[PDB]
């Protein structure tokens, strides 16, 4: 059954039917056992494709909305805003879905440093995606929940993973984006990203055969952000 679900998740991924990949991997998560690296990754890809489709839609519609505000077409504005809201409803439902799977199933069953950091960082990512479109109280609560999860992931990562580890780097990259895009803090975003990058450069001997390409790519992204932000 667990192997069958993995197989079905992999078929859905090949067919680019990410909804189905999510349903298959959600059933694996629901077994209340430690996921393998492969399963963790399948689950995370599934949801990142599902949410990423709506985030890309959201950003297109919001830009359209911004163009129309500049020309004051209010009939158009009406429909664009109603359409945005609908996509926001979907983003909320999807984030709420994985955040429940994380809280119910994933985080309670996680018993390795690596998996705990991966799931807390995921929790940080999904609150952060809530925060991207949230205003008012919702934005504050999403930002606080994201911050808490990313600090929790950081606490474990600092003690349990080498600074070159791809999940630790991935956490640094996304938490720096969080400080930049949600907390509006370019200075803290830059420090976190720069620290993560310097700490890995200091310990390049910790680079693993399994993930040196993954580490190198994240370190290049940390650098691309720092470029973008300074």
């Amino acid at each position: 059954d667990r192997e069958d679900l993995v197989y079905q998740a992999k078929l859905a991924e090949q067919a680019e039917r990410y909804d189905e990949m999510v349903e298959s991997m959600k059933k694996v998560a629901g077994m209340d056992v430690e996921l393998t690296v492969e399963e963790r990754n399948l689950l995370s890809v599934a949801y990142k494709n599902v949410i990423g489709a709506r985030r890309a839609s959201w950003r297109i519609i919001s830009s359209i909305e911004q163009k129309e505000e500049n020309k004051g077409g209010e009939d158009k504005l009406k429909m664009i805003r109603e359409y945005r809201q609908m996509v926001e409803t979907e983003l909320k439902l999807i984030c709420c879905d994985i955040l429940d799977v994380l809280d119910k199933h994933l985080i309670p069953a996680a018993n390795t440093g690596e998996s705990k950091v991966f799931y807390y960082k995921m929790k940080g990512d999904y609150h952060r995606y809530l925060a991207e479109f949230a205003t008012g109280n919702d934005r504050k609560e999403a930002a606080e929940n994201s911050l808490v999860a990313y600090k929790a992931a950081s606490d474990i990562a600092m003690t349990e993973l080498p600074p070159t580890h791809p999940i630790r780097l991935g956490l640094a990259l996304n938490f720096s984006v969080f400080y930049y895009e949600i907390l509006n803090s370019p200075d803290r975003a830059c420090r976190l990203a720069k620290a993560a990058f310097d700490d890995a450069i200091a310990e390049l001997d910790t680079l693993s055969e399994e993930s040196y390409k993954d580490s190198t790519l994240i370190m290049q992204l940390l650098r691309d952000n720092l470029t973008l932000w300074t």
Binding site: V45, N49, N174, V177, L217, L221, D224, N225, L228
Partner: peptide, 7 residues
């Protein structure tokens, strides 16, 4: 527009 971890 910042880069986050790819997938």
């Amino acid at each position: 527009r910042s880069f986050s971890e790819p997938f």
